[PDB]
Amino acid sequence: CVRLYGPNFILQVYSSSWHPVCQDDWNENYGRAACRDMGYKNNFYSSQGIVDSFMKLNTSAIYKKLYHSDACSSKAVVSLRCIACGVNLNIVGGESALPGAWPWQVSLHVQNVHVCGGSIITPEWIVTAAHCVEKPLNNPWHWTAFAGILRQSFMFYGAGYQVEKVISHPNYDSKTKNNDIALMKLQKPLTFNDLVKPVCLPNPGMMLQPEQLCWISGWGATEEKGKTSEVLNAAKVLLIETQRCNSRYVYDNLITPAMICAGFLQGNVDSCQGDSGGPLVTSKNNIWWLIGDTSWGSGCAKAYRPGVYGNVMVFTDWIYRQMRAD
Ligand SMILES: *[C@@H]1O[C@H](CO)[C@@H](O[C@@H]2O[C@H](CO)[C@@H](O)[C@H](O)[C@H]2NC(C)=O)[C@H](O)[C@H]1NC(C)=O
Numbered sequence: 001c002v003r004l005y006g007p008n009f010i011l012q013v014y015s016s017s018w019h020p021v022c023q024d025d026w027n028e029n030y031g032r033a034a035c036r037d038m039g040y041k042n043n044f045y046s047s048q049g050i051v052d053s054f055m056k057l058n059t060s061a062i063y064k065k066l067y068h069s070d071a072c073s074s075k076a077v078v079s080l081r082c083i084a085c086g087v088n089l090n091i092v093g094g095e096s097a098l099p100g101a102w103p104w105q106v107s108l109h110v111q112n113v114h115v116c117g118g119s120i121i122t123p124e125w126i127v128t129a130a131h132c133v134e135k136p137l138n139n140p141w142h143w144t145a146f147a148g149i150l151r152q153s154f155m156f157y158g159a160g161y162q163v164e165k166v167i168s169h170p171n172y173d174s175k176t177k178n179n180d181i182a183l184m185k186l187q188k189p190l191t192f193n194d195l196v197k198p199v200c201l202p203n204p205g206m207m208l209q210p211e212q213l214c215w216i217s218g219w220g221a222t223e224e225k226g227k228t229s230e231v232l233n234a235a236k237v238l239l240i241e242t243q244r245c246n247s248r249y250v251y252d253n254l255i256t257p258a259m260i261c262a263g264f265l266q267g268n269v270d271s272c273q274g275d276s277g278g279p280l281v282t283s284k285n286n287i288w289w290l291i292g293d294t295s296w297g298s299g300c301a302k303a304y305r306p307g308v309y310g311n312v313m314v315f316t317d318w319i320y321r322q323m324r325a326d
Pocket residue numbers: 058059060061067
């Protein structure tokens with residue numbers, strides 16, 4: 001019953017609404033304990049008092065040691081970051097990605113060939129699409145991950161990161177593609193550097209614009225019915241309002257609250273076969289956030305047939321629980 005709220009990572013605790021935690025008597029050790037509860041295990045980044053009813057710490061005997069208070073004597077609330085994420089440098093109709101521009105991007109291989117995309121969230125956890133791991137690719141032995149390499153010809157056999165665990169959302173529906181999200185855990189943790197870094201998981205209360213400016217990246221075909229791209233490509237896309245995406249001329253009521261549309265109704269710029277499982281990201285408060293995972297669409301870059309992505313914000317607490325359960 002502990003969460004991070006908005007682009008400023010305000011620590012909140014639930015009461016049978018949600019209230020922010022006082023900076024009073026708080027320290028890095030309480031922050032570490034809060035991150036462990038969220039399933040971040042050994043990950044911790046920062047804990048600081050932001051000037052934004054409250055939950056106050058009881059200096060007697062992490063969640064059970066908080067009580068409701070009218071005011072914070074420190075006149076600040078806790079801002080909690082569990083991992084250094086969402087920092088980078090500085091597909092149809094896109095452009096070659098630069099080194100370090102999309103450092104959370106991974107290429108997921110089966111039998112030495114790219115199958116799907118993925119997004120690094122921790123040194124051992126990757127977010128992908130549940131449709132990527134449908135039978136007969138449900139078992140983790142099939143899979144290997146490539147990070148910090150832009151080119152498929154530079155992804156050598158024996159050099160990938162073996163996948164040890166595969167977890168599909170319990171409500172994934174293969175007919176409709178509803179709840180199209182899965183997690184992969186690596187056998188060995190990744191080494192973060194200027195080319196390999198995680199993207200931030202989205203917090204409730206991001207307050208994105210109806211047509212928020214986003215980016216997609218992947219090794220998917222550069223034209224409908226085309227082959228896997230040898231190079232990583234990236235493109236700017238705008239969110240498409242669900243009411244508009246659900247209209248008779250677009251996807252006629254097939255867009256659920258677990259899905260987000262992005263792209264252009266005139267087409268020309270879109271995700272395609274092989275981009276699936278990959279990131280849909282946005283920049284807000286100088287942080288890159290994982291808004292979606294490439295899920296589905298009718299054809300590629302066709303007019304009135306945009307891209308459909310898993311609504312990652314809806315899945316964040318399910319993700320936390322799987323990371324904690326491991
Ligand atoms: C801070 O913690 C103490 C100790 O857990 C709380 O005191 C207990 O309150 C319950 C009733 O809710 C009593 O049954 C216990 O006997 C109390 N314990 C002790 C050691 O006296 C205290 O209420 C908490 N402070 C606040 C402001 O909530």
